[PDB]
Amino acid sequence: GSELSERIESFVETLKRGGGPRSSEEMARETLGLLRQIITDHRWSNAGELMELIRREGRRMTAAQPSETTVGNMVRRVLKIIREEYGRLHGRQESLHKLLTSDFSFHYAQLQSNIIEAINELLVELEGTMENIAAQALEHIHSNEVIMTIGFSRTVEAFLKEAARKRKFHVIVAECAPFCQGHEMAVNLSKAGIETTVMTDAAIFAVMSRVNKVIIGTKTILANGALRAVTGTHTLALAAKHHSTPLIVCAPMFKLSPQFPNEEDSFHKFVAPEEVLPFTEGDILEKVSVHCPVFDYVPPELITLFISNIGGNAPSYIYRLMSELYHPDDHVL
Amino acid sequence: MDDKELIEYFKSQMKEDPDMASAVAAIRTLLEFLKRDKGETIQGLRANLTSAIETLCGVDSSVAVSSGGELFLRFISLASLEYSDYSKCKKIMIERGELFLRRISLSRNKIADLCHTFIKDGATILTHAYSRVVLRVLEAAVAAKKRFSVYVTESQPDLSGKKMAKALCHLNVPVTVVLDAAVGYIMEKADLVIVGAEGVVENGGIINKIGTNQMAVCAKAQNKPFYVVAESFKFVRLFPLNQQDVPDKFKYKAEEHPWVDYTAPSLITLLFTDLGVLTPSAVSDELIKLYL
Amino acid sequence: MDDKELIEYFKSQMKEDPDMASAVAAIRTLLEFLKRDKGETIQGLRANLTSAIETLCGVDSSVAVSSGGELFLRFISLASLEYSDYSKCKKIMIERGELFLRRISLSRNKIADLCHTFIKDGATILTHAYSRVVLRVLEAAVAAKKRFSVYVTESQPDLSGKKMAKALCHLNVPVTVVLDAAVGYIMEKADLVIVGAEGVVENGGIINKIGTNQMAVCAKAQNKPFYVVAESFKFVRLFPLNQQDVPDKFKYKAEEHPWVDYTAPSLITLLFTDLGVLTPSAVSDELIKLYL
Secondary structure, three states, rough: HHHHHHHHHHHHHHHHHOOOOOOHHHHHHHHHHOOOOOOOOOOOOOOHHHHHHHHHHHHHHHOOOOOOOOHHHHHHHHHHHHHHHHHHHHHOOHHHHHHOOOOOOOOOOOOHHHHHHHHHHHHHHHOHHHHHHHHHOOOOOOOEEEEEEEOOHHHHHHHHHOOOOOOOEEEEOOOOOOOOHHHHHHHHHHHHOEEEEEEOHHHHHHHHOOOOEEOOOOOOOOOOOOOEEEHHHHHHHHHHHHHHOOOOEEEEEEEEOOOOOOOOOOOOOOOOOOHHHOOHHHHHHHHOOOOOOOOOEOHHHHEEEEEEOOEEOOHHHHHHHHHHHHHHHOOOO | HHHHHHHHHHHHHHHHHOOOOOHHHHHHHHHHHOOOOOOOHHHHHHHHHHHHHHHHHHHOHHHHHHHHHHHHHHHHHHHHHHHHOOOHHHHHHHHHHHHHHHHHHHHHHHHHHHHHOOOOOOEEEOOOOOOHHHHHHHHHHOOOOOOOOOEEEEEOOOOOOHHHHHHHOOOOOOOOEOOOOOHHHOOOOOEEEEOOOOOOOOOOOEEOOOHHHHHHHHHOOOOOOEEEEHHHHHOOOOOEEEEEEOOOHHOOOOOOOEEEEEEEEHOOOEEEEEEEEEOOOHHHHHHHOOOO | OHHHHHHHHHHHHHOOOOOOHHHHHHHHHHHHHHOOOOOOHHHHHHHHHHHHHHHHHHHOHHHOOOHHHHHHHHHHHHHHHOOOOHHHHHHHHHHHHHHHHHHHHHHHHHHHHHHHOOOOOOOOEOOOOOHHHHHHHHHHHHHHOOOEEEEEEEOOOOOOHHHHHHHHHHHOOEEEEOOOOOOHOOOOOOOOOEEEOOEEEOOOOEEOOOOOHHHHHHHHHHHOOEEEEOHHHHHHOOOOOOOOOOHHHOOOOOOOOOOOOEEOHHHEEEEEEEEEOOOHHHHHHHHHHHOO
């Protein structure tokens, strides 16, 4: 449809030009709604053509902004939903069992309703992820604890606000320079009565010796349990590992991406050097190369626990969750 | 058939195709034994297959042959569970074995295609000894028009590292040969380590040539990623607590010169198998899924 | 004194007493050069001694020779600081050199008598290659009526490990020979590692045969004490930042095969020298005390 096409182009341009849905949950919701509209409006005779068109718009969406993995995650979730619905309606993972024991394009005229119902169920599950994560705050925070945060994470903010109803603790927030969004987080936490401290990134390793545990958010969870987080999270994780401080990642399930850390030089988001070195410096900007990476790679061995809407897991289990969310044939997309 | 011609078939099939691995040849020999058995009972078939696996593992002391034998026994047990009647079971086992043979043949190309992406342009690659899967990975990488250097170790008990260096020079890839005592010296030059495996133990560690453990320890000490390429038919439910806990049938006959050692899963970054790229914790799950 | 007779004297003193080490032979050759120099100025004396040290290090590419060269130059500098007149300074130098030679000749037995008490009854000792100081400490430990089993590495590029095994079986000490690649396999059976060193750098690390770093890292990974027995005159004021920072004159001529490697002081428990039992941090202090 023309309206569907204009909505797709609006989404693509919003992704390309930055901004858009500030919260990752909002953009996941928008991606799911767009995918539902594409499924409804477009004409597809069978499951294979629907798969091909979903993959085509998913490729365009991912090429719009590769650093935002949520869109590709939702596209792959919809593809896996289509796979499971078609398999359940028509017929009856690579393992040793399958290897020892050992097709689409058959039209059924009943798959669309099941696909839409599954997408709606996914949307309802997506709506309550933050409350589900926050409900586990008291199991991980004790009396007079010291928590450490970097930047502004809405899930971690909800976590701490829910924990603060019954326990008293201290929170140290490190500003995520240059976009010092930790100031907003510290002000918001102080509004709720939690005693809070503002400090720079350079002080992280200076104060980790007096921190009990580190609770952080992330942008992406990779297939091996690695993280794409805000820049400065890798050094914070290294400092926590130096002191054996437990590092907890509060991240919903829709931030799990089936790719591997093999990709390089496009992982980080490089933005204008104005954030690091102002334009008013003058002539020295001619011969100075200044880079401003927005994201950081965190190896899985630096993460102690993952708290999601389904509970707590170790990084070593992340692979299984991957196999429970995405088909291996959709990793390349 | 008979023990003599069983061993002869094993050796001849290994000889006629020097590319095919020992485990693949053992599985093919066991499938050929199954084809011509003239038996009527699944109990006698199981006993005779166990005896044939014992003979084959007596011919050569490799972990991969025993792993393939256990996998074959599990395959037979699963097929027997599916079909009660032996006459119907036999044909199903034969066709399933043919498909299994084709899949384990394609495993090497699957591993190479999946693994070649982790090595960059200008990267320095460290290998330990001769490994056909590592060679396939490097061939796929150079086919992808990537430029990199490779270091190999001489692998003193049998200079198979020199064989690997010759095979790599045959394709004109820049390679270097270092002593078995130079690994710790050369680790800082390299960016990642790629080794093969003769067998993957239950907890995610690996069994491989005697120099693998020290290379893994050095890579961990200098924070270098340690990658292992291994086929799925090398999964064994063995749990070595230490080096001495490794069965002696795999150390010797394959002052004191063991042929293999064991590497713990904590020293391994990722494993590249025909099932995909796995964490060491996945392997155990696989085994737990296979044996109910 | 001609250059030819200098090389001839060096080689003759090395060959006549194989027990005596290369550094002692170099220092003896330098003192013999100083014995008959027919000169009148200390400036030309220092220049001639420096040139003799360069040609001697041309003869042998060992770190110990250069260690002795710098130590001897410092000895001349201090002696000149003591006395301005050339004749009195020269006689002071010859007496001091004779005393210095006497004291450095008996360092090995002091290290043995101070280090044999760290060996326990029924211990399992791992060592890298041939080192006369380790032979001496093991002989003293046996003379202390102690029973232990020694493991040694074959030291592939020149099988000095086999020579160590023969020289240890000469006294009927139970010894075993393992490959260079089997070191990581053997660490868990050994109780402690004792090695020598061709040179002790400023920060407390050591320069030794190419396989020492692997053993140090493996022992650290397995929590085993790592003891280094070395002489005082092997104290170079070098500060290698990594394996590449080692001077190339010591790696080669003594595909690409380095002959030495550097071990960081954090991988070393104690150093057994004629000065005593020291932590690595002491060594630097010594050098700081030597050069004002």
